[PDB]
Design a binder for this molecule. Structure first.
Ligand code: SF4
Ligand SMILES: [Ca+2]
Length: 349
DNA sequence: AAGACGTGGAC
DNA sequence: GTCCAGTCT
């Protein structure tokens, strides 16, 4: 494996200095900000993350401010980003950093990795970029790039394949400046060596790329096809009382959409009667106004919205809470239920 | 191991 | 429609 590591390095790092996007989290190397951006970037595109990162850092300018904030306030800031246990884990990890480590982000891989939500990629991403620690930062971009560079045909969906890529990076990483190197590989996959129609002709490391020589760039990386996924009808109801207040409820911390608020729903494995019975509060449910789909990575919801009129015969017991329409802004809903409300509003016109 | 776990660009 | 931008269990 006569791979000219140093030669390869100098070129890649040169192209990076010329073409790097000026992104908000690249203004400096504050471990806190880098860490926040890398969590936001997990399975989430850069252009999507930019506005979230700006508001989040404005609301929580430092690690302590995030640790000090309330769970609701943090989760509201994550509303719409998806995979919401990321922020549950980041909040807890930061709380841990505050109480245990006195505010400083641990610079040791094994100590940093021990924190919730910090997987192999985030360790390398945060520690290299912000501390100089030469740990690999292998994401989907890197895997695709390396798979083509070294013509690796292993299924990237296998945890072992990733472990191999990490070993490859180690073999070729620029230990002088690992952060800059790690980001360069990622940026490469993001800008040049794209999932489709890679610009190999413009690529700075074309010379070293084994997939280019064989003309199989498009066919890599190898990855098992995503399968079809379970469908799940859902019955949702918007119960408004005479005064205009609407009833909502906070989902439990274990499972789908943990700790997010929603409109009282039940899986329609009978329709309305199930909603009616479930809440068994003196509530009456009416014709379903609209139906639609909302997808997940591992299932698909088919929703049905039933307006109802709430009559007060008792108190509001947890998890349920009663909220005026004006104060719904304060609660973090998932996108599925955000649409439920919008359709309800348009209907009531 | 492979399924859980959200959402929106870009074909 | 398909693909895809990580971590926990
Ligand atoms: S030459 Fe083509 S396949 Fe190889 S790294 Fe560059 S863009 Fe990717
Ligand atoms: Ca870890």
């Amino acid at each position: 494996e006569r791979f000219p590591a140093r030669e390869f390095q100098r070129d890649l790092l040169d192209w990076f200095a010329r073409e790097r996007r000026d992104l908000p989290w690249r203004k400096d190397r504050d471990p806190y900000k880098v860490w926040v951006s890398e969590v936001m970037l997990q399975q989430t595109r850069v252009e999507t993350v930019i506005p979230y990162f700006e508001q989040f850092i404005d609301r929580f300018p430092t690690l302590e401010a995030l640790a000090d904030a309330d769970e609701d306030e943090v989760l509201k800031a994550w509303e719409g980003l998806g995979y919401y246990s990321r922020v549950r884990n980041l909040h807890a990890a930061v709380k841990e950093v505050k109480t245990r480590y006195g505010g400083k982000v641990p610079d040791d891989p094994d100590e940093f990795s021990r924190l919730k939500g910090v997987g192999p990629y985030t360790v390398g991403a945060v520690l290299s970029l912000a501390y100089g620690v030469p740990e690999p930062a292998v994401d989907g971009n890197v895997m695709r790039v390396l798979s083509r560079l070294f013509l690796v045909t292993d299924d990237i969906a296998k945890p072992s394949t990733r472990k191999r890529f990490e070993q490859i990076v180690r073999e070729i990483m620029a230990y002088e400046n690992p952060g800059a190197f790690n980001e360069a590989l990622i940026e490469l996959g993001a800008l040049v060596c794209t999932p489709r129609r890679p610009s190999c002709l413009l690529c700075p490391v074309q010379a070293y790329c084994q997939a280019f020589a064989e003309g199989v760039a498009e066919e890599l990386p190898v990855k098992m096809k995503k399968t079809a996924v379970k469908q799940v009808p859902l019955a949702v109801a918007v119960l408004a009382d005479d005064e205009g207040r609407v009833l909502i409820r906070k989902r439990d911390s274990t499972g789908l959409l943990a700790n997010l608020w929603e409109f009282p729903s039940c899986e329609t494995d009978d329709g309305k009667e199930k909603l009616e019975q479930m809440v068994g509060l003196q509530v009456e449910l009416t014709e379903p106004i609209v139906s639609f789909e909302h997808a997940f990575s591992h299932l698909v919801w088919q929703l049905t919205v039933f307006p109802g009129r709430l009559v007060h015969g008792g108190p509001v017991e947890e998890p349920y809470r009663l909220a005026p329409e004006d104060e719904l802004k304060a609660y973090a809903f998932p996108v599925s239920h955000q649409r439920v409300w919008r359709e309800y509003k348009e209907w009531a016109s």
